[PDB]
Structure 1
């Protein structure tokens, strides 16, 4: 599936891993995404009430499933059924955030 892995222990919670289907779906190149916060997929038509939720889940560090509007590198807009999950891989502490993306 399309998914990425982010490391919240780094400044701005950057994408450190992105599956191939993800790069296919967004039309970007691995060199472009890696190191960057995912928000670069949002645009003028993206609902901010949705982006607010995502922001909450992240800070509060919980799971969430939000439908958000994104734009490929080319400029084409698409619906993104986004699901968030926490890699509590630790012993309480959050180590990674896993995100699954689906063009819907």
Structure 2
């Protein structure tokens, strides 16, 4: 199944990046990503998604995503991300590596879900208890 078509239909917040390009930049973003983050598309295309990060983002959470990308692994993390206006929100984030029939990573899709503080407390706790 097209996971992307599934996300389009469900009108989710997601982006697709191209690892064949230096620094793995956004080459597609849904309307949902734009509404959520406040960015317009010319602000987002061709950029690494790390702009979503800021001073209050947990760097160990970011490392999980980094490893997942190095391994062509699917993963999820709850971390804090930044809107175009500098304000934060909690992101239940998911990333998938898409592979061809030959097994080679061809793209990444990242899905963003806004969650409450209460939600984040629970998930971040198990993340910190994982880190310790």
Same fold (TM over 0.5): yes
- Greater RCO, CA 8 A, separation 6+: 1
Radius of gyration: which is bigger?
2
RMSD over equivalenced CA pairs, Å: 0.7
Q: Which has the higher strand share?
A: 1
Runs of 4+ residues deviating >6 angstroms: none
Partner residue, 2:51: 40
Partner residue, 1:97: 108
Runs (5+) with no aligned partner, structure 2: 1-11, 116-132
Deviation at 1:89, TM superposition (A): 2.7
Question: For residues 13-28 of structure 1, what are the structure 2 equivalents within 5 Å?
Answer: 13-28=24-39
Partner residue, 1:61: 72
Q: Which has the higher helix share?
A: 2
- Number of matched pairs: 104
Runs (5+) with no aligned partner, structure 1: none
TM-score (norm 2): 0.77
Deviation at 1:76, TM superposition (A): 1.3
